[PDB]
Amino acid sequence: ILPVSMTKTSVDCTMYICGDSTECSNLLLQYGSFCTQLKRALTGIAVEQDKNTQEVFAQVKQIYKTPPIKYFGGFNFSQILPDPSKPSKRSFIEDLLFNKVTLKFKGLTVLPPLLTDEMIAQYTSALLAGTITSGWTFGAGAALQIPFAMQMAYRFNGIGVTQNVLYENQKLIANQFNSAIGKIQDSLSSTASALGKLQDVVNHNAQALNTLVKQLSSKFGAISSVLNDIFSRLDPPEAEVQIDRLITGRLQSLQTYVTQQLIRAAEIRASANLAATKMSECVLGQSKRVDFCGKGYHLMSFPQSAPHGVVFLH
Amino acid sequence: QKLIANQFNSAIGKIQDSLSSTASALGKLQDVVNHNAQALNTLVKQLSSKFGAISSVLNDIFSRLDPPEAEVQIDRLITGRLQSLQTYVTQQLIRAAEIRASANLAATKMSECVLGQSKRVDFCGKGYHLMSFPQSAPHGVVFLHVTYVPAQEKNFTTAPAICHDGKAHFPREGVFVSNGTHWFVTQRNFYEPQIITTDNTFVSGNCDVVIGIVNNTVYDPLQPELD
Amino acid sequence: IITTDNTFVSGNCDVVIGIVNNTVYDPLQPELD
Amino acid sequence: SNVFQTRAGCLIGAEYVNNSYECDIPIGAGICASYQTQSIIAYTMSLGAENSVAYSNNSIAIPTNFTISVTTE
């Protein structure tokens, strides 16, 4: 489970301060326009997660199309490939994951993901199709066709298994594969912690969000942290400068919040480079890496989406 | 040798045509500089930023207000300029770690791209990797990644097994093909006629598992020597 | 030693530049099989 | 001009086309833009050419050529 995106959040300046009160804007501009560069950094952030999605999901040349009939001359792949029968074209595992993971906010915005859930779903489907039908080459241009029995004979020679163990006994290894997949799906449905690293980040975000929410009452020296309370029971002469110190305080707060946001974004960035490297190696061939696509003499990996990340079934 | 060398020459021409036509493709290399300057800009902007003070410069407030009514304000000025600096340097560190990882990556690039060839499929440039040639930059590096991308795929006929005298045979390295009135053996990843000896087939199992397969004769490479 | 086993043939000896002519012996001959 | 409504919100000043084109300026929530040549069209981001690769069993398609391409990292 690799957190690959993050909620591309953003913060409006005046919507965060008070709304449309004019003393807010005048004290702001007298202080300065820091929130300009703050939201500059955040918009940056957002576009890096956009690029993370692009560089993790859609490295392929074009959107290789799967046949809806998951039949490849003796193989059934509806368990792994999506079937069009659902209103959403998603593989069963991805739907189990999205339902299994439970996911305009008063001054803070959650910009929508550019690559929509269905769109990232078609990326996943297409790259799955490339990996299975066309094989390892699909990341270097056209996804060249080649017969899967030959692909599997070649794979077994990769791990040093001859071709008679397959063309006579495809079924044993395939059934072990599918049964293990079934055990996986059972775990995923039943174990809510097996995907922790994908909602904790949201929790992080949430708590970070909560942090800025929580700070909204922190006062920093004077009596009342509500702008309207000061503007009401304090006369405008002093209310100006009291609102000014509050501006100072939550400016510090938002800066600190977005600094944690940047650092979390750096973590996301490392993880997303990780995800892209997995999406290359683990996906585009029998990966030589031994403990990078999962433990052991790694064979391959199948990705599925998540509300903000990816899941590689190694 | 010669024709691939010439196609590399064509790749060279593509290199120059792209680079002359792409002088701005250094965006990913140049943006950071702006950020630095931008960060610098920001710090300069905060020289003008009051941070709650009646002004943002030391000299004017010192000259206007004699110290006995200005020491505390001077000290707050000091603290605000400080906190600006620590914040700025904090983003400096964040980006510092960013480029830190980036150039760890870069050293890896030159190791597995310059000092060697990376088996990794999307690490040294797009797709299959041959080589990489570095170049300097005002603050970074450029890798001309020289990579492989196939094309022109056309259909021919292969076989999964050969039932020779009831014995299942499977290709060692290469596949059967037929170009017209003739059948030969080529390689798996590309097309080339090759020497047809016993070397291209190995026995594992029988041909009774797949019903109706054809029966074939594999000549001994020593019988023509025997006669 | 350059023998039939440890070498391959792909195209005639016109694609190599400045080629030289030499004799390479087939390993089957000493066995006389 | 014409006003379109997408999951990201309300796109005005864009003549929402339904046609498939490669994406240049991603507009949001899965929709991108292009230049009509005149006016600026917005559409559902044409995902790509759905290359339905042909699975094969007992015949192959050899890549008879290639390109030694060069990229700038």
UniProtKB/Swiss-Prot annotation, chain B:
Changing residue 199 to H: In strain: Alpha/B.1.1.7. Changing residue 108 to I: In strain: Gamma/P.1. Residues 1-51 are annotated as: Heptad repeat 1. Disulfide bonds join 113-124, 163-207. Residues 30-74 form a coiled coil. Changing residue 182 to Y: In strain: Theta/P.3. It comes from the Viruses. Glycans are attached at residues 155, 179, 215. Subunit of the fusion protein that is processed upon entry into the host cell. Mediates fusion of the virion and cellular membranes by functioning as a class I viral fusion protein. Contains a viral fusion peptide that is unmasked after S2 cleavage. This cleavage can occur at the cell membrane by host TMPRSS2 or during endocytosis by host CSTL. In either case, this triggers an extensive and irreversible conformational change that leads to fusion of the viral envelope with the cellular cytoplasmic membrane, releasing viral genomic RNA into the host cell cytoplasm. This is Spike protein S2'. It comes from Severe acute respiratory syndrome coronavirus 2 (2019-nCoV). The gene is S. The chain holds residues 920 to 1146 of 1273 of the full protein.
